[PDB]
Design a binder for this molecule. Structure first.
Ligand SMILES: CC(C)[C@H](NC(=O)OC(C)(C)C)C(=O)N[C@H]1Cc2cccc(c2)OCCCCOC(=O)[C@@H]2CCCN(N2)C1=O
Length: 167
């Protein structure tokens, strides 16, 4: 039947203590290649992905950034496509808190790093591929956000203790 946009979850921990679950709708109907990358990295089904990785940069009033599961500091990560991959489209815009979007290092350099907006970030439109949104647990993102700082360093260790697909 109809392709249903996937739902994936992160179970977040703070210095190893459970915080809560954030779930995301992935817009596979608009950005299928970008949605599939994040989906597969969330289930771990290729043998690598987000489980155990950290949020390395959190700026209150802006965004939480994660997905560097290879170097844990924003210099690493990889997609499921054996190389960085193209900006699929910029159809979806950075409209407010909860938007899930790809981090990158230039045109057509998407890997595994992503960010969750905690504010409207419209100046990123046409530069970062929006591919999902928080579905449930925006309150957990708001709780994470409090452990960031102006320069992005986190004051507690924010990890994805578990992750996977709900639907
Ligand atoms: C994904 C890694 C590989 C990549 N590395 C990188 O490009 O490395 C160099 C510079 C080539 C060596 C990176 O992290 N890309 C950054 C670029 C950026 C964009 C917009 C503003 C930026 C930086 O900085 C200003 C504000 C700092 C806080 O906002 C942030 O950190 C942003 C928040 C959105 C996601 N976001 N990070 C990125 O897509």
């Amino acid at each position: 039947g109809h392709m249903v946009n996937p739902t994936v979850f992160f179970d977040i921990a703070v210095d190893g203590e459970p915080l809560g679950r954030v779930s995301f709708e992935l817009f596979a109907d608009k950005v299928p290649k970008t949605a599939e990358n994040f989906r597969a990295l969330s289930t771990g089904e290729k043998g690598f992905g987000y489980k155990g990785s950290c949020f390395h940069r959190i700026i209150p009033g802006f965004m939480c950034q994660g997905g560097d599961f290879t170097r844990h500091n924003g210099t690493g990560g990889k997609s499921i496509y054996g190389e960085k991959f193209e900006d699929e489209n910029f159809i979806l815009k950075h409209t407010g808190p909860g938007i899930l979007s790809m981090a990158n290092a230039g045109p057509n350099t998407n890997g595994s790093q992503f960010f969750i907006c905690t504010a409207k970030t419209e100046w990123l439109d046409g530069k970062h591929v929006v591919f999902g949104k928080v579905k449930e647990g925006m309150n957990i993102v708001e709780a994470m956000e409090r452990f960031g700082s102006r320069n992005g360093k986190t004051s507690k260790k924010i990890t994805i203790a578990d992750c996977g697909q709900l639907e």
